[PDB]
Amino acid sequence: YLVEFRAGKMSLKGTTVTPDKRKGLVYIQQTDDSLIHFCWKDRTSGTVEDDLIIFPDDCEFKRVPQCPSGRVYVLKFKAGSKRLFFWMQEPKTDQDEEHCRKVNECLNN
Numbered sequence: 001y002l003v004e005f006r007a008g009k010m011s012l013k014g015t016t017v018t019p020d021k022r023k024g025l026v027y028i029q030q031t032d033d034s035l036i037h038f039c040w041k042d043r044t045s046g047t048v049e050d051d052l053i054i055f056p057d058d059c060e061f062k063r064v065p066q067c068p069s070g071r072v073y074v075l076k077f078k079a080g081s082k083r084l085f086f087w088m089q090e091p092k093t094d095q096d097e098e099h100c101r102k103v104n105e106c107l108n109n
């Protein structure tokens with residue numbers, strides 16, 4: 001994996017963005033066709049539930065500022081305003097911003 005870190009996901013439940021409680025792993029992998037996949041894996045089951053091919057400039061990964069936990073990040077698509085939300089699961093917050101920087105580097109490089 002190019003980048004990996006502990007994080008939960010969220011889903012739209014009707015109109016409502018709803019955090020998924022499961023322990024998860026976000027990772028980015030380059031496949032042998034040279035494409036870049038942004039993925040989310042359920043740590044308990046091992047199942048990869050999300051696998052998105054991302055090209056440079058498609059996305060920006062960013063902290064969501066108004067969340068009091070400070071742990072919520074969004075993968076925002078520049079075309080269509082599609083958004084995927086994640087919440088950091090490492091117990092200390094020290095590495096959150098570095099994980100975020102590494103995501104943007106891997107996707108845009």
